[PDB]
């Protein structure tokens, strides 16, 4: 109940020194869907307090790991010392089709491996030489991006001049990205920086090229990074409905299909957080409308398909109803098998900037209740959307600390937790089923009708696993 949730927040905050207490209070809230502006209840997108074990990453993760890294036929340089690119090598399951090392390069780690001489004298000469070596040893790459790590902006390197000069010399696309980890407060500013880099260096290359012919049905999937194949199980529904998916940003994405995107008729935005910036740009510059949609679970997928079709003519609306009729026995069979196993179970979530609200409908399609949710780096407009999706008097947490999250869980006692790899092994030891809701725990896809079957199978297999009844020894 509301009063009990507020007392819970206050009791957990007691451990903090005064300064941290006053700030963390602004980031914890009891849901109120009737409030028109979320900033009146919860504050977000602020600096993390020092020493409290935030779960956030940095702008390089938001740029290299999230937006640019999945683009499959370009080579992305982790520019700076060796650590960043090694820890982020192949940790994110942005799936693609390619011949890795030959024409696609996603799971490789290219780096300038800065040594002390590079810090002291600058890395611009090294970057120039590295680019020539890339061109010799990977001749089928279709472009290079330069993903700046922390020291680049600190030592005063000019990667923009390198990219302009070398790009002219070799007639190749070289994209400088200033996503140093000290910028911003989280992955979020990295998204924005990465969007602006696409805008400034790539997206306009075909503005004067009129060889590609549009159709009235051309769309682009904006903000789906194909985790476990999510975007493919989305694309198949859109093209069964009669549309033509010209581009995927950026899961399984090629640089050409990015350059073809200003030719589409409608931008379909899944991840609003990471890609609303470029969607707004394309509306302003090219007049392309954009719309948000949601492909988690049958209720939202059906909702989305119909809303998308309504932007087109009668033939697409007809094909939409034919797609919905095709899959109805499939997801009804998923519900009939798995909803009785999961009904009434309560879940707490903590994820990045989209899924903490976007997966709610999928859990509700299996009879489960989301009793607490939060984000690492969402903004006010994400929370605007969240309070409408979550039930009254549920718990919301922004940039939750390791300590808060453990205390919230202990009091609330959810049946399932969905969060990340740094959270997973904490809560299994407490006897609480846990599902990774970034990596899908090496399963998926979860998007679409085909993904719902896997999602339902996965929540059942973990929540109801026999191992959870064995944690207390019979002699204790």
């Amino acid at each position: 109940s509301r009063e009990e949730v507020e007392s819970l927040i206050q009791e957990v905050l007691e451990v903090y020194p005064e300064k941290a207490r006053k700030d963390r209070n602004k980031h914890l809230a009891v849901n109120d869907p009737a409030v028109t502006q979320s900033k009146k209840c919860i504050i977000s997108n602020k600096k993390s307090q020092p020493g409290l074990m935030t779960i956030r990453g940095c702008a390089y993760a938001g740029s290299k790991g999230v937006v640019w890294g999945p683009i499959k036929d370009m080579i992305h340089i982790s520019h700076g010392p060796v650590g960043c690119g090694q820890y982020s090598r192949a940790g994110r399951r942005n799936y693609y089709i390619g011949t890795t090392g030959v024409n696609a390069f996603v799971t490789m780690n290219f780096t300038s491996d800065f040594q002390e001489k590079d810090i002291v004298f600058g890395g611009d000469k090294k970057l120039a030489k590295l680019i020539d070596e890339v061109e010799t040893l990977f001749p089928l790459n279709k472009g290079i991006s330069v993903q700046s790590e922390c020291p680049i902006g600190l030592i005063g390197d000019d990667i923009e001049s390198v990219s302009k000069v070398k790009g002219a010399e070799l007639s190749k696309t070289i994209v400088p990205v200033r996503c140093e980890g000290f910028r911003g407060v989280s992955q979020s500013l990295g998204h924005h920086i990465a969007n602006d880099a696409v805008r400034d260096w790539v997206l306009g290359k075909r503005d004067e090229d009129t060889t590609f012919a549009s159709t009235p049905y051309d769309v682009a999937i904006i903000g789906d990074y194909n985790i476990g194949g999510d975007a493919w199980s989305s694309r198949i529904l859109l093209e069964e409905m009669g549309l033509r998916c010209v581009a995927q940003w950026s899961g399984d994405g090629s640089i050409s299909e990015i350059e073809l995107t200003p030719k589409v008729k409608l931008n379909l935005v899944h991840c609003y957080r990471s890609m609303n910036y470029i969607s707004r740009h394309m509306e302003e510059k090219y007049g392309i409308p954009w719309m948000e949609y949601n492909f988690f679970g049958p209720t939202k997928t059906i909702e989305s398909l119909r809303a998308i079709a309504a932007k087109f003519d009668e033939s697409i609306q007809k094909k939409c109803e034919e797609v919905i009729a095709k899959y109805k026995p499939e997801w009804e069979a998923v519900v009939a098998k798995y909803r009785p196993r999961l009904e009434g179970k309560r879940v707490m979530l903590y994820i990045g900037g989209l899924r903490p609200r976007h997966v709610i409908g999928a859990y509700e399609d299996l009879g489960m209740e989301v009793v607490g949710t939060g984000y690492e780096f969402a903004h006010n407009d994400d929370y605007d959307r969240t309070m409408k999706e979550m039930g009254d008097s549920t718990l919301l947490y922004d940039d939750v600390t390791g300590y808060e999250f453990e205390e919230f869980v202990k009091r609330i006692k959810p049946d399932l937790i969905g969060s990340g790899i740094k959270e997973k092994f904490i809560f299994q030891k407490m006897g609480i089923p846990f599902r990774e809701m970034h990596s899908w725990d090496y399963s998926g896809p979860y998007h679409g009708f085909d993904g719902f079957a896997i999602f339902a199978r996965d929540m059942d297999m973990t929540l109801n696993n026999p191992c959870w009844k064995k944690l207390q020894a019979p002699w204790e």
Partner: protein, 522 residues
């Protein structure tokens, strides 16, 4: 589509015909992909000796490295101290990555904090982050000690760690008695092993530098053991077991085995076990200090010899037969304790296994990589088994380490075909396993992509990976294994010979083609 009673995940879902057709249409329609003939032609070129020469001419580009950065090692070092919170002064993105990396290898929680220096700290320094950070960390997670390392931003802007920590105590953010050892750990010098050495020397100094007048060597009758950067739980345990078996008093300095192996019993334990502060304060009173991984404990050695005045013995890593022998003999000499019959028998059981398996191991050719001490110990044991190390790669090795390993190779006939590479990466190694193909790779999970590459050339060119090292992310619970001592030598031997026999079974499984050699008995 899905059949509800046989649900397909990504593999094999996307092999369905409608998904295949869709992906072909995406490629042809919008990806402007290179023709498959060109892709095949370029791939073949990357397997050639011509490509290798260009590959080894790289001076600026690094591709698929086999090392990480200093603070990762500092965090691991810090985790081996009782109730100790690793704390990396600098930017928070680093700590998310350090924690995740170790999460995936150990399948355990990894606790570590940042003080979240952002662009403001970049302009005006990180002193306020350190003050509030130390207070917040101590208040919220209640450690007995905070071990401070640094991210590269904090090194570049030149934050004075000592002054910041001193000011935090002076201005009252933490008590003056509260232990906050620290170390500078720049990612652009050395590698993750260097961060472990730097952190350990920092902690050793904190507890003993200003307190040497009262100490006498050998007065506590123990031997100090410093393990270095170690990611096999069995390695901590086998050293402690062998010393206990001899009755040798010891102190293991940095012991994360308990906090990296808590039981699942209903409760989360942020801290467990660990070297005590009193053990660090008392360590100068030991008879001596043994460094298990000397090639990345060189700052620690200088301090142990310079300040504690311990005559640190010249021992290699205790891997294989000869070097486990030398380790035990030195411990016996220092401690005065005899080597018991139980260890003599264990040794004889390892030798017995060597005689049992020598015909399958003889002449087998290996490519291998890892940290310097691990690699030289694996090289040594391979020679003892009559195997041929052929490609020996240590990205973070140095020139005098290479000279030492070259001398080990020159002393055995089985070394005749071996070359040691330093400062080279896994893209260099990929070239080597095409142009001078070995039977197997021994390395970490990043090796799987080299194996994938070799198979694409053809089944006869495939080089299978044997997973020994760090990190291992794509198998479960191998971090529980042992590579040190006689116990580790037995585990490695068993893995190597059964890898050979598994591959031979695969090659002889074809009925009426190769199964004439599909023997029941091997």
């Amino acid at each position: 589509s899905q059949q509800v009673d046989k649900i397909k995940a990504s593999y094999p879902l996307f092999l369905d015909q409608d998904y295949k057709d869709m992906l072909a249409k995406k490629r042809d329609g919008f990806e402007e992909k290179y023709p498959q003939d060109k892709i095949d032609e370029v791939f073949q070129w990357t397997t050639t000796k011509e490509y290798q020469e260009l590959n080894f001419q790289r001076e600026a580009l690094t591709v698929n490295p086999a090392k990480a950065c200093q603070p990762l090692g500092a965090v691991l070092c810090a985790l081996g101290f009782e109730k100790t919170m690793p704390y990396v002064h600098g930017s928070q993105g680093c700590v998310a990555y350090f924690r995740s990396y170790f999460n995936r290898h150990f399948r355990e929680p990894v606790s570590c904090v940042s003080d979240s220096m952002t662009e403001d700290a970049a302009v005006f320094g990180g002193q306020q982050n350190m003050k509030d950070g130390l207070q917040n960390c101590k208040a919220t997670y209640k450690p007995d000690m905070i071990a401070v390392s640094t991210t590269c931003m904090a090194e570049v802007i030149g934050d004075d760690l000592n002054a910041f920590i001193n000011n935090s105590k002076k201005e009252g953010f933490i008590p003056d008695e509260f232990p906050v050892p620290f170390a500078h750990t720049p990612s652009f010098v050395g590698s993750h092993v260097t961060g472990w050495d730097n952190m350990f020397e920092g902690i050793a100094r904190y507890f003993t530098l200003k307190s040497m007048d009262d100490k006498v060597v050998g007065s506590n009758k123990k031997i100090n053991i410093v393990p270095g950067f170690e990611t096999y739980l069995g390695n901590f345990r086998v050293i402690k077991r062998m010393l206990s078996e001899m009755g040798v008093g010891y102190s293991l300095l940095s012991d994360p085995e308990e906090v990296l192996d808590t039981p699942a019993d209903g409760q989360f334990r942020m801290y467990a076990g660990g070297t005590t502060q009193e053990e660090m304060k008392d360590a100068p009173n030991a008879l001596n200090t043994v460094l298990l991984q000397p090639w990345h404990l060189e700052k620690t050695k200088k301090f142990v010899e310079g300040t504690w005045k311990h005559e640190v013995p010249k021992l290699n890593i205790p891997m294989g037969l000869d070097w486990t022998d030398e380790f035990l003999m030195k411990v016996s000499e220092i401690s005065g304790q005899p080597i018991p019959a139980s260890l003599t028998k264990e040794r004889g059981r390892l030798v017995d296994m060597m005689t049992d398996s020598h015909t399958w191991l003889h002449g087998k050719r290996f490519a291998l990589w890892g940290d310097p001490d691990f690699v030289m110990g694996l090289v040594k044991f391979l020679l003892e088994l009559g195997c041929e190390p052929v490609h020996i790669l240590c990205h973070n090795g140095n020139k005098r380490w290479k000279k030492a390993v070259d001398a080990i190779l020159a002393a055995s006939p089985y070394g005749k075909n071996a070359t040691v590479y330093i400062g080279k990466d896994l893209w260099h190694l990929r070239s080597l396993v095409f142009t001078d193909k070995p039977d197997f790779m021994i390395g970490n999970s990043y090796g799987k992509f080299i194996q994938r590459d070799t198979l694409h050339k053809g089944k006869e060119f495939e080089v299978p990976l044997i997973r020994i090292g760090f990190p291992i992310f794509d198998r479960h619970h191998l971090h529980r294994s042992t590579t040190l001592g006689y116990e580790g030598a037995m585990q490695i031997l068993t893995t190597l010979v059964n890898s050979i026999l598994e591959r031979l079974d695969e090659e002889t499984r074809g009925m009426q083609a190769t199964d004439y050699n599909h023997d029941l008995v091997r």
